[PDB]
Amino acid sequence: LQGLLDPESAHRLAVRFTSLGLLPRARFQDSDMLEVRVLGHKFRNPVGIAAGFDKHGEAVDGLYKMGFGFVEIGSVTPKPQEGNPRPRVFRLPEDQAVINRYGFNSHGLSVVEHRLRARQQKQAKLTEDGLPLGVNLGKNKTSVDAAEDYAEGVRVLGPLADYLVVNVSSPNTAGLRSLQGKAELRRLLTKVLQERDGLRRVHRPAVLVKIAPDLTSQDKEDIASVVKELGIDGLIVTNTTVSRPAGLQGALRSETGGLSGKPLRDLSTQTIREMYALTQGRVPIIGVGGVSSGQDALEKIRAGASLVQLYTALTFWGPPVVGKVKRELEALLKEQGFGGVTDAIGADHR
Ligand SMILES: Cc1cc2nc3c(=O)[nH]c(=O)nc-3n(C[C@H](O)[C@H](O)[C@H](O)COP(=O)(O)O)c2cc1C
Ligand SMILES: CCOC(=O)c1sc(Nc2ccc(C)c(Cl)c2)nc1-c1ccccc1
Numbered sequence: 001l002q003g004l005l006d007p008e009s010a011h012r013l014a015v016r017f018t019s020l021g022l023l024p025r026a027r028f029q030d031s032d033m034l035e036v037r038v039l040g041h042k043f044r045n046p047v048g049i050a051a052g053f054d055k056h057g058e059a060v061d062g063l064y065k066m067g068f069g070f071v072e073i074g075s076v077t078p079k080p081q082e083g084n085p086r087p088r089v090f091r092l093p094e095d096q097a098v099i100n101r102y103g104f105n106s107h108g109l110s111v112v113e114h115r116l117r118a119r120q121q122k123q124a125k126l127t128e129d130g131l132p133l134g135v136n137l138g139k140n141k142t143s144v145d146a147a148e149d150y151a152e153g154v155r156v157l158g159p160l161a162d163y164l165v166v167n168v169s170s171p172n173t174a175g176l177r178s179l180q181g182k183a184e185l186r187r188l189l190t191k192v193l194q195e196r197d198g199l200r201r202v203h204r205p206a207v208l209v210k211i212a213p214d215l216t217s218q219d220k221e222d223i224a225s226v227v228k229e230l231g232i233d234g235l236i237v238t239n240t241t242v243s244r245p246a247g248l249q250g251a252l253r254s255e256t257g258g259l260s261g262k263p264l265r266d267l268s269t270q271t272i273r274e275m276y277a278l279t280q281g282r283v284p285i286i287g288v289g290g291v292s293s294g295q296d297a298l299e300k301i302r303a304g305a306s307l308v309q310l311y312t313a314l315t316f317w318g319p320p321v322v323g324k325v326k327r328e329l330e331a332l333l334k335e336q337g338f339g340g341v342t343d344a345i346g347a348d349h350r
C-alpha cells in the first residue's frame with residue numbers, strides 16, 4: 001500500500017502475502033492464442049514476472065497462481081550480501097515510475113539452491129505444463145573475478161533452472177555494466193557457456209544475457225556480434241535506465257539508481273527493435289520495461305520480443321494488471337489479424 005508503507009516495506013509485504021498464497025487465484029484462463037514455444041520450452045502465456053520482485057525464490061508458486069506464464073527469480077549472488085543502505089527504492093507516482101538502488105541484496109546461492117530443491121519436482125511438473133522458471137545471476141560487490149561469480153551461479157542454480165540469465169546490466173554495482181563491452185563480454189560468456197555445457201542434459205538450461213537500455217549503437221552491435229558468435233540462447237531487453245528522460249515530475253526523480261516503469265517503456269521497445277534486427281530475428285528476446293497493458297506488451301512483441309515481463313506496473317496497479325495485460329493482449333491480437341502471439345513476434349520488421 002503506497003499510503004501507509006514505504007516502498008521497500010510494501011515490497012516485503014507483497015512477497016510475503018504472495019508466498020503465503022493469500023491472494024485469490026486468477027480467474028482469467030489462458031487461451032491457446034497466448035501459447036509460445038521458445039528456449040526449448042512451452043510457455044502457456046508470454047507474460048512473466050521480471051527479476052527483482054522475488055530476488056530469493058520465496059514466492060515462485062504464488063506468482064504462477066497470480067497468472068504469470070513464467071517466473072524469473074534473482075538476481076542471486078554467490079555469497080549472501082545485504083546491498084545498499086536504506087532507503088534504496090523510491091516511488092514516482094506522477095510518472096508511474098520507480099527508482100531503485102538495492103545493489104544485489106541476496107540470500108546467496110546456497111540458500112536459494114536449498115529453497116528451489118525443496119520444490120524441484122513440483123517445478124518440473126509446472127515446466128512440463130508450460131510454466132517455466134528462470135534464474136537471474138548476479139555478482140558479489142567485493143568479488144575479484146566477475147566471470148567466476150557467474151560460473152559458480154551456473155553450477156549451483158543452472159541445474160534447477162529452465163533458463164539462466166547473466167545479468168550484466170544492473171546500474172547499482174560498480175563496474176558491472178562494463179561487462180557488456182565486447183572483449184569482456186566474450187570472455188565472460190565463453191566461460192559461462194562452458195560451465196553450462198558441462199551439466200547433465202536434463203539439467204541443462206538455456207542461457208540469456210540481460211542488457212541495459214543505455215547502450216551506445218556500438219555496444220549493441222558488439223553484443224549482437226558476440227551473441228551470434230557464441231550461440232547465446234537469448235536476450236533480456238532491458239534492465240532499468242540510469243538516464244532521466246525530460247518530463248519526469250516526481251519529487252524523487254534525482255535519486256541515484258535505476259529508473260523503471262512507464263518512462264522506460266519506449267526506450268526499452270526501441271532496444272528490442274534494434275537487437276531483433278542486429279540478430280536477424282534468430283535470437284529470442286524477452287521484452288521488459290514499462291509494460292502495464294496489452295498494447296504495451298504487443299508493441300514489444302511486434303518489435304521482436306517472443307516473451308515479455310513486467311515489474312513496476314505491479315507497484316501501482318497490483319495483481320489485477322496481470323489478467324488485464326493478458327486479456328488486452330488477446331483482444332488486440334484478434335483485432336490486428338494475428339492467429340496468436342507467435343505470428344506477431346517481429347511483425348513490425350515485416
Ligand atoms: C525494485 C527493482 C529491483 C530490481 N532488481 C533486479 C535484479 O535484481 N536483477 C535484474 O536483472 N533486474 C532487476 N530489476 C529490473 C527489472 O527486472 C526490469 O528489468 C525493469 O524494472 C524494467 O521493467 P519494469 O518497467 O516493468 O519494472 C529490478 C527492478 C526493480 C524496480
Ligand atoms: C501500492 C501497492 O504497494 C506497493 O507499493 C507494491 S505492491 C506490489 N505487488 C503486490 C503483490 C501482492 C499484493 C497483494 C499487492 Cl497489493 C501488491 N509490489 C510493490 C512494490 C515492489 C517493489 C518496490 C516497491 C513496491
Ligand SMILES: O=C(O)c1cc(=O)[nH]c(=O)[nH]1
Nearest residue numbers: 102103104170172240258
Ligand atoms: O539489485 C539491484 O539494485 C538491481 C539489479 C538490477 O539488475 N536492476 C536494478 O534495477 N536494480
